[PDB]
Amino acid sequence: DAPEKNYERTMAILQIESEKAELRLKELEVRRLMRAKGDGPWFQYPTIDKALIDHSPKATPDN
């Protein structure tokens, strides 16, 4: 191969791998923040559905 070909192919390799490494670091930071705060879509552990609640007038009023 030409030195030009090896050179610019190396530059394409380095761009792809440095982008993947920066995305992995951001992935770790996103996971840490979402586990710590619970405000993203990950680590959304379930709670009770409020659509199960009966809101009808019951037998006794103090409720």
Next chain:
Amino acid sequence: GWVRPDLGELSKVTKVKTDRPLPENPYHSRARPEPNPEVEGDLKPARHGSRLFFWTM
């Protein structure tokens, strides 16, 4: 002149005209927490694949 109610009448659900206001918060509840932000936007492919150590897809 009072007429005794028939079978079924005293168990009816009646309507009541009042002058007191309807309670806006009968449970004395505070404000609910704001929900988590939803998903929006188109779903793009994963940038350079799985990014699992050496797999290019």
